[PDB]
Amino acid sequence: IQRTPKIQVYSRHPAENGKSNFLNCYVSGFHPSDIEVDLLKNGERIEKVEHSDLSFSKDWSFYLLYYTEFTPTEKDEYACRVNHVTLSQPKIVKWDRDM
Amino acid sequence: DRVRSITLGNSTITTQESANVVVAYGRWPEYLKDNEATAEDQPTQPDVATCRFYTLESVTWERDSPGWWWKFPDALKDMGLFGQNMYYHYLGRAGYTIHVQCNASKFHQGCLMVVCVPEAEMGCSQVDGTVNEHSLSEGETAKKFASTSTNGTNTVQSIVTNAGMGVGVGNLTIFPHQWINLRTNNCATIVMPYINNVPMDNMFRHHNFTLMIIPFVPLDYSSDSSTYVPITVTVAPMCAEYNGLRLATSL
Amino acid sequence: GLPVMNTPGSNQFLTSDDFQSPSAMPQFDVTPELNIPGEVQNLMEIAEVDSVVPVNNVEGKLDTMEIYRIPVQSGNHQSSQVFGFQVQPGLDNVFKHTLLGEILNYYAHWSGSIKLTFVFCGSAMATGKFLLAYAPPGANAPKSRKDAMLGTHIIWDVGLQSSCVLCIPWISQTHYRLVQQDEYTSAGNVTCWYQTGIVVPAGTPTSCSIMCFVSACNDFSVRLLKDTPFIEQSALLQ
Amino acid sequence: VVEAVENAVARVADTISSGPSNSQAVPALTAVETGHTSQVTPSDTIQTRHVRNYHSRSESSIENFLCRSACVYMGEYHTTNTDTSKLFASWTINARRMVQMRRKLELFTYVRFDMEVTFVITSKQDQGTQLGQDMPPLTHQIMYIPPGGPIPKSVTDYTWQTSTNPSIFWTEGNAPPRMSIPFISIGNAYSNFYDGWSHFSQNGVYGYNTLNHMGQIYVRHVNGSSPLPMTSTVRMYFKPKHVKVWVPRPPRLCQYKNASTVNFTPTNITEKRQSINYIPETVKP
């Protein structure tokens, strides 16, 4: 009775610098009710971060999406850190400006 | 007049401080008759490999002990071939002989009640809650009563003055019972027939009767006497029958 | 058709009636009868079984087993009473929750004689003698052994046999008494005293306990069914 | 033809005369360790006269003790509402919601009997800002559904056709309805106590709710009427007959908590008094 999460970080609008954009971190396929999701700007934990409702799919696996507002820049990076019951150490996923 | 011997199978029990023998309702264990049966297959009767004496593990009577209880069956499910026949069959049926043993010197004092309660349905410590199977029985190990109210979780409300059933403990003499008075006797014997509202039943799902041992007068001695006083229980099935042979179940 | 006339009591529902009635399941084949041990035919069979009496119902011991033990010790205590109580098998606190007491509280009238068995639970080396006395109504409770010896009494000697029976005989002006007893249907009282004392050798405990059981004799009967005042609810689903 | 039947009256034992005694017979000495209850009368301890006793134990028989009708269920339902669930009454059949008959029956482990059921139905007009109407007499339908039959979804359901279910139609102002039921159980007797589980792995449901399985009752108005709201109440009464019981038990001491389990709050053994020697004085000037 255990399912390890699955992480996907992306952006709503295309990543060209100067334009306002939405960075999204989408976790899906995990069956505890508890999970720790945070956003990082080159390690800097973003303060203003909103979330969505904690719903589940038809296989009774939960999914949750965090979204933040930003603007892309060639210099800075973005990442999503997650601590979980299945994870021995928190996973950090680096945001690709294409995926 | 106070010496007695009981032989069953390849086992025998002797006593020199017996009071008498209680037959639960004047009925001895019997086999099932043709004009009262319902299952059509031919039953098996081991008749000497299951009808014999098994000894449980002992408990230690201390100065402040509330009491103990065991459930039957499910206390003999690991006892030789009587336990194996339980795992392979769907229906079973048997009577019992119970022998309780506790000896002390002429300088000790105390009094125990030994009682067999049919269908001792027990209540939970949380009124809107449910008990566990582990909370009701532990096989060969005894469960313990308490002196005050228990809180726990999924446990039996085991204050001894209510006997875990919501009744007055002083009225349990309505059931088949004996007393052990340390100044009079050192053993108790009860012969119990098969009691149920159906002719046969499954032995893993239904606890037929409960054996309770409760000290009404606490144990006492003075200043050089033995402090360790154990109690031992020994049970023998009688007229055992089984029906419904298939592969072995698992728990 | 046939001329008839309706009498008073028509179209009423009396709880204690017994008339024939139509069956809702015609020609239903019931399960055969099984011969189960322990069949009951009369509630008087239950009241004839002994049950332990909570004589020590004092403050602070109502929820412990100590409520069942009468204390008794060695030494000079011939001036102090062992115990005493009223004979009210359905009203007194010491009797109303026993088997006999719980059966009587379903009725209004009772009659017959009672049995009180007493068991001594000391060591095998202790000896003693007791005086158990019953006094019919008409005077106050005896306050010494000299007064108590005037009623119906037995002198109990402790030995190999550990139990002694005091039989309370039916002595009354009416044929029945009320389960809810008043001054007019009093029954008397019972008391216990030291007759000779308790003597023990060295190496034994000096304190001991006595227990008391109650039951009914074979001339006992009850009548006038009623509801019992011990159980109650405030709403359904209970 | 006429056949005469004889009934044997059974009275209590008489008292025989006894005189003084000095011997080795000791009826007053015994041993309670044997689990045996002594059978001694006053004739063995005192001097008694001879009495011819005429008292009878007729009212303590099991039949006369249990053959009394008592309430086991009480329910309400409306003629019109905005819920569609208050328009009928329905419940599962058992004698465990009211404490009097429950405690009376629980004095025994196994019971077997037939039953006589009686219903008491009363209506009333709900309080409102405007009364005054002319409504014909109300008629009520009572349907018994054995375990496994279809369930009504509303008060206008096809299931009310009662093609095979037994049903009762009753008009107000008449005698209360009544019907007899035989002993309907798959076992050889009803069980008030069951120390077991429902599943062979020793888990699931524990206790009495594993063995009840005897159907439900539904009750409705048949008029579909009443421009002004009204309310009806139904009470059910059971009365066993041709009774047999087995394995007496000690009476219930603690109060009940729910209908399914036997759970309880710990209670005292009895009430207190001043001392172990206290008896009140009643002969005072």
């Binding site: 939405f22 009710s33 589940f56 009774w60 | 449910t130 566990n132 999924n154 | - | 599943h199």
Partner: protein, 263 residues
């Protein structure tokens, strides 16, 4: 078109989190949000954009509270030790013209273990836990008839109301934006990647073509946005060469024809 409700209850909740919460879905996107820390439903203001005066939101508050107390009662019938999570999927979906089809399934610790049958109006399963919980829910003595009418007269009625009450909020249709790029890989290889942003209908088809011959679909990743729009992605690792030949063709309902995408 189908109305659905996802209900979740936990036995040992974390501090600050509700012990029971519900989410409503009218097809592909959500329109309801409920929890036990507040006790009332909340819309999104994007389906009817009109607060029905206490007759659509005070009507759902009651049955959601009933479900809350039922799911919380469902935990006192389990004698086990470890924590528990109870999930429920309840709703309906209308047929061709009439005759809605209902749905009621439940799962314990991530395994579907019981459902609700209508001809008897009872909850049912085969595990011991299913029977215990179903017995405790039926002892509530009014719960069977209430859910039995929740699934045959309330949700189909709400569905027929919703299909024409905010009808303009059902033709959400946006053409997705294509961003096809490439990035390095292991020596000799390179990863192409074609994405799609802000497309309302969830259905979307992607594929890789070498010059005019399809080379597969790769791996399709899907992710919702914080407004209802969706994001799709596909990638393919190929040789270092031919990277100027590939043209991923994307077809979408918001597109009039399968527009080709060029690097």
């Amino acid at each position: 078109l189908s109305l659905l409700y996802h209900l979740t209850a936990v036995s040992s909740p974390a501090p600050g989190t509700p012990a029971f919460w519900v989410s409503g879905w009218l097809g592909p996107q959500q329109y309801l949000s409920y929890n036990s820390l507040r006790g009332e439903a909340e819309p999104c203001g994007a389906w009817v954009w009109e607060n029905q005066v206490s007759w659509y939101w005070e009507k759902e508050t009651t049955d959601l509270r009933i479900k809350e107390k039922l799911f919380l009662e469902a935990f006192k019938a389990l004698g086990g030790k470890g924590p528990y999570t109870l999930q429920g999927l309840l709703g309906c979906e209308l047929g061709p013209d009439n005759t809605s089809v209902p749905t009621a399934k439940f799962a314990l610790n991530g395994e579907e273990f019981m459902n609700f049958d209508l001809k008897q109006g009872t909850w049912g399963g085969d595990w011991p836990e299913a029977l215990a919980i179903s017995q405790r829910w039926q002892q509530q003595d009014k719960a069977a008839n209430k859910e039995l009418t929740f699934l045959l007269f309330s949700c189909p009625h709400r569905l027929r109301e919703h299909l024409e009450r905010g009808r303009g909020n059902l033709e959400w249709k946006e053409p997705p934006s294509m961003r096809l790029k490439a990035r390095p890989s292991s020596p000799g290889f390179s990863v192409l990647t074609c994405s799609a942003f802000s497309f309302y209908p969830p259905e979307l088809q992607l594929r890789f073509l070498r010059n005019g011959l399809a080379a597969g679909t790769g791996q399709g990743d899907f992710g919702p946005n914080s407004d209802g729009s969706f994001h799709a992605s596909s990638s393919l690792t190929v040789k270092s060469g031919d990277e100027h030949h590939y043209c991923c063709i994307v077809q979408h309902a918001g597109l009039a024809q399968p527009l080709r995408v060029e690097l």
